[PDB]
Every structure is written in structure tokens, then in C-alpha cells.
Design a protein around this nucleic acid. Structure first.
Ligand code: CA
Ligand code: CA
Length: 220
DNA sequence: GCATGATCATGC
DNA sequence: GCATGATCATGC
């Protein structure tokens, strides 16, 4: 079930490319909800089971033996991303120590298997199709971009400007809330260096960044 | 129209 | 609350 090599994983992915969520779900005996409003990570999980990836909250890696991270990517009819891509929670405290090279973010984005999927809301969940696999590793430029944003956003977190951080900061990667809702709370750093309560934040890739990944693939 | 800010399920 | 998986939907 669990692929032993990259070749096997890419082969299994290519095998489910073109299937509908319904066909795949039924084949795996997984119940399909009416929509994603209250099952937001359903497609993600559907693919994990279909490709033999690590389920549950197992830390940072779907195919640890391969060093590959699996990520679904919703796209519209023109092949453009319908949503941003979550990368990982941001450490709002004790971030002291990590450099870009040894970041959770860089690690999770070092080798990604993107599985594009039909994401248009008007399409009945059961009828949406799974796209062809896209195996990606950031180019020099992409990492230069990712690194820049990471350092910028991290400095703010390390300097208590948590109250200045807005989803507008960052060219390709940004910080947006990540949790149950607006009342969720985590430990952070105050305007005066004191541990306070604040909203949990996570790193996300803007649609423009992932769209380029989709484009650089087509131009192949 | 769509990005920002909000929100939903689950296991421990 | 955190870490897994993300999409929703209101404000502009
Ligand atoms: Ca996983
Ligand atoms: Ca994953």
C-alpha cells in the first residue's frame, strides 16, 4: 500500500488522475459528504489514503522514507488556484534559534507532490476530478523568494509586532489565522517582550506562487 | 470579484 | 492548544 520508491508513488498518483472523488471514495469505502463546508480537509485525506501516506497528526511528513510532502491544490476550469496553500503553523514564541535553512517551512516545501483537484463550488463534490501529479522542488528563485518572506515575517514575530502582522505582508508567502476560529488563542510576544495571548498564525502560499508552479509544469 | 480574516473536523 | 487536512464568506 505504501510506495517504496518515488517511481511507485508517481505511478500510483498517475493511476488516480482523472478519477472523480466519488469513484475513488467508493473504491476505498470512504463516505462522501454533500459539500466541503464541514469537511474541509476531506479531499486531502482522500488522497492520503489513496497514495498510502501517513494519516493523522504525524509530524510534518507524508512519506518520510521518501522525503516527500503531499498537497492537494484546488483549481478552477482555467487551471488557476482557487485557494491559498497552508504550509505550517508559525511559532510565535521561542522562535529564537531557527535559520531559513533549518525551518519547518523550508523542510515541508523542499519536496512536494502537488495533486491538483477540481475545486469549483458549483461542481457536486462527487463529480470533481483528480488531476495529474506534479512533483516539485523549489527553483533557486522560488527559494530566494520564500526565504525573503520567511525572514521578514519571522522578524516581526520575534520583535512583538504581532499586532502589525497582516496577511498583506509577504510577496509569495504570508501569515493568516490558523485555528478553530477568531477566539482561538496561543502564546506570543507583546509589544514589550512579555508573553501574551494572541491569535494563532500559519504560513500560506499565495495563489500567484502555486500558479507559477502549475505554469512552469505546463511549459514542460 | 476575490484576498483577508474566519472558520470546520479530528486526535490526543 | 497543537498539528494534521484545508475551504469558507464577509469586507472592500
Ligand atoms: Ca499527512
Ligand atoms: Ca501533506
Amino acid at each position: 500500500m505504501i510506495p517504496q520508491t518515488l517511481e511507485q508513488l508517481l505511478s500510483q498518483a498517475q493511476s488516480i488522475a482523472g478519477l472523480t472523488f466519488g469513484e475513488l471514495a467508493d473504491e476505498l469505502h470512504i463516505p462522501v459528504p454533500i459539500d466541503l463546508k464541514r469537511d474541509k480537509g476531506w479531499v486531502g485525506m482522500l488522497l492520503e489514503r489513496a497514495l498510502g501516506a501517513t494519516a493523522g497528526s504525524k509530524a510534518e511528513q507524508d512519506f518520510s522514507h521518501l522525503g516527500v510532502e503531499l498537497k492537494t491544490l484546488p483549481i478552477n476550469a482555467e487551471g488557476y488556484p482557487l485557494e491559498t496553500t497552508f504550509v505550517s503553523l508559525a511559532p510565535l514564541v521561542q522562535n529564537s534559534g531557527v535559520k531559513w535553512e533549518n525551518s519547518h517551512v523550508r523542510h515541508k516545501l523542499s519536496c512536494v507532490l502537488w495533486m491538483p483537484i477540481e475545486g469549483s463550488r458549483h461542481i457536486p463534490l462527487r463529480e470533481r476530478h483528480i488531476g495529474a501529479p506534479i512533483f516539485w522542488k523549489p527553483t533557486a528563485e522560488q527559494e530566494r523568494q520564500l526565504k525573503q518572506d520567511w525572514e521578514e515575517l519571522m522578524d516581526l514575530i520575534v520583535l512583538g509586532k504581532l499586532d502589525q502582522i497582516t496577511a498583506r505582508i509577504g510577496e509569495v508567502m504570508q501569515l493568516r489565522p490558523k485555528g478553530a476560529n477568531s477566539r482561538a488563542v496561543t502564546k506570543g510576544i507583546g509589544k514589550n517582550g512579555e508573553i501574551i495571548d494572541t491569535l494563532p498564525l500559519g504560513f500560506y502560499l499565495r495563489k500567484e506562487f502555486t500558479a507559477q508552479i502549475l505554469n512552469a509544469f505546463l511549459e514542460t
